[PDB]
């Protein structure tokens, strides 16, 4: 069971990298959305 727990720790490391990948995906999505909104707002302010 300790060896199985070590395999579970490896799977948990894979879960942590999956959590990292989902966090990177959400971070990139929020970052692109905010940067696009900010660029549009800055362009609108510059046009005004």
């Amino acid at each position: 069971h300790q060896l199985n727990e070590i395999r579970k720790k490896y799977t948990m490391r894979k879960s942590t990298i999956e959590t990292l990948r989902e966090k990177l995906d959400q971070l990139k999505r929020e970052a692109r959305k905010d940067v696009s909104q900010k660029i549009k707002d800055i362009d609108d302010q510059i046009q005004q």
Partner: protein, 48 residues
Amino acid sequence: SKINERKNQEQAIASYEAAKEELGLKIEQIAQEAQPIKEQYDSTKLAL
């Protein structure tokens, strides 16, 4: 997994708070140095 996510988020928040405190001191000193420049500009404008 959620405790680890919260821990890294809390570490980022602590880094942001430390940056906020140091940046607040930096802006305070920058304003203190900038005020004489504004006074010199006003005196130069009045002389001109």
